[model samples]
Target: TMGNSTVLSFCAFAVDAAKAYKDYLASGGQPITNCVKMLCTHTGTGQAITVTPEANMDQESFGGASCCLYCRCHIDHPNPKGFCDLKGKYVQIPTTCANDPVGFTLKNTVCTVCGMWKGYGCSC
Candidate 1:
């Protein structure tokens, strides 16, 4: 059972490698591979972990997608907080209130140290 998982992992890696090889052939100028790193989290401790293939892994696959916290506090306050974790994990906060309003790129959405989310015309 222990080795079974390793085999499965290698199989997945192989598939990714094959895909990369195909991409290498398609691109005329340079040999580029379309690959991505997978970020995983632990259920027990919420530990964030990243798995990367060592077989000629490209720089593009170095960083994985980030995870975000969807926070909405009040509509009247309009303090919607869009917090993102670059490690593709949930970012824990001590509180859910912000002293200063911080805007997120998602337009009009705001966040703070307290980490609360609110929408426009919404009441606290």
Candidate 2:
């Protein structure tokens, strides 16, 4: 099972894991020591890697490892599905884009725009 495919998969998982952890921290959660590096290393190597942060913490230490950093920009990931404007447009992503882990669906079956079910990316 430990092969190139597995390695790549693990790497992806690590990235997502790190991002999730970073999101947690950004949401006033907590500081996990080297959370990002640990995620990648642990999943890639399957070893117990410990994380030790540097002294005098600052933004420099916090790289762009989560949506929080991106949120500083115009991209606002308010939830797991990112920012949803009043128009129901994703702005940065398509309304029906396959971006979420479990995906997203419109809250109402009828699209207010065309007043029709399944309008554009709308779902019933």
Model 2 agreement with the true structure over 1-124: per-residue lDDT tens digits: 2332342233244535335444543466433222121112111211111122111111111112321222222234446876432221111112233132111121223355533324333333
Model 1, 12-113: lDDT tens digits are: 345343333334334531221221333322122211212331111111112322211121111121135533432342321111211111111122332443
Candidate 2 similarity to native, TM-score: 0.16
Candidate 2: list runs displaced more than 4 Å. Answer: 1-15, 33-124
Q: Give the winner by lDDT.
A: 2
Model 1 weakest lDDT span, ten residues long: 94-103
lDDT of each: 0.25, 0.27
